[PDB]
Amino acid sequence: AAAQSVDQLIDARGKVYFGVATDQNRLTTGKNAAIIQADFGQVTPENSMKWDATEPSQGNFNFAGADYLVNWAQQNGKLIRGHTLVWHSQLPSWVVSITDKNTLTNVMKNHITTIMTRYIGKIRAWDVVNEAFNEDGSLRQTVFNNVIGEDYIPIAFRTARAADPNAKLYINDYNLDSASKPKTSAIVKRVKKWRAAGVPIDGIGSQTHLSAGQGASIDAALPNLASAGTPEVAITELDIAGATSTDYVDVVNACLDVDSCIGITVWGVADPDSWRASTTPLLFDGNFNPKPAYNAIVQLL
């Protein structure tokens, strides 16, 4: 663990948290738990709350992993972001094979309601719909869009609000890093339209999986996302190829400049455990020591 907590420092600047993705497999190995306890104030389950993990067979739920994380976070005073109710990836075959609208709508609502109810009042925010947009700004043609239609989004949010009215409901996506990107403009436009129609969308999550030198672009992209009018915006799965301090400080600054940005979550603790470990994109190295970017974020805060 680093002696200085990026979480406590960002809290002092008026933000809610600086967190990280994790799960039981990480918390029970290496120095992961000690680092999270000392330096971060929020956790997102990396995989334990996904559909394949929680409902592997229709109606036969599995909460072992998710329960471990929620209990661990509560005991350790860490906020929790529930990660992902409706998504086309890590989706069991039994769901994807359904072609009937009514059958899929009930399956989707039952999945959302069951998971949100089990942890009602303990989860700060949920990524209700994940990666619903194509790169051109059109809606991604997943089983949900194809079978239920465009209304699957409003239905998912309505159901989630009813399940736990205490949770902030987010739509999460990636490649929202440049203000000029077709996807960035589309999600801002669509979220304004959905909110105008009464859809309960509290936040826009920007994954922020960056390439080296891209951090400067989020200084302009984040204010644009905040213009959709949602109560909150957040950097949800930050990592940057090469991990330069310039890119990391720019992302932190973008959040400080935007009042509605409530916090940042980095996607993992140590480099070798990253989904793209080859790029060494995280704040702690393979020996669990803080990298120059960690210290640069501390000094900036």
One-letter amino acid at 107 equals V
Query: Which of the 8 DSSP states describes residue 192?
Result: H
The DSSP bridge partners found for residue 171 are 129, 204
Catalytic residues: 131, 237
Tokens of 120: 């009602």
Cα angle 13, 23, 89; round to 5: 100
- Experimental determination technique: X-ray
Query: Can you give the resolution of this entry in Å?
Result: 1.8
Judged by DSSP in three states, 62 sits in coil
DSSP of 79-142: EEEEEEEE-SSS--HHHHT---HHHHHHHHHHHHHHHHHHTTTT-SEEEEEES-B-TTSSBP--
Q: Which domains does the chain have, with CATH numbers?
A: 1-301 (3.20.20.80)
Place of tokens 């935007």: 258
